[PDB]
Design a protein around this nucleic acid. Sequence first.
RNA 1: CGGAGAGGUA
DNA 2: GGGTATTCGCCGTGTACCTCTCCTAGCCC
DNA 3: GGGCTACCTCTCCATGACGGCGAATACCC
Lengths: 23, 36
Amino acid sequence: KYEDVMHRVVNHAHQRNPNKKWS
Amino acid sequence: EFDAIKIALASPDMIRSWSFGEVKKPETINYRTFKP
RNA sequence: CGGAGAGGUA
DNA sequence: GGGTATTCGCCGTGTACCTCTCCTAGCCC
DNA sequence: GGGCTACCTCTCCATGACGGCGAATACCC
């Protein structure tokens, strides 16, 4: 019975400009 | 302990010498039991 | 005990 | 075809630190 | 609103850096 943790992963860079690099 | 560091290309047989088992499923852990 | 962002210090 | 320009693509852009906030979508219940 | 189950790849988000250097074509006989 799967509640797979990859569906709970925090998008921890949710404030970055999408054009910045290396992260 | 050790002298110079060497770097080289990774042969597929060498990669199979590094490894310990083929990964076949994208699931990671369960979260109902925290055992993987 | 994980990384981003915002402000600030020299 | 051989040397020369021209566009195109990558690499880079100071250290150390102090606070705070903020972290999942869809949906059929 | 919210608790249970899960993306097992779809469209316009974007849009105000600049220098430098080297490679990959553009071209002129």
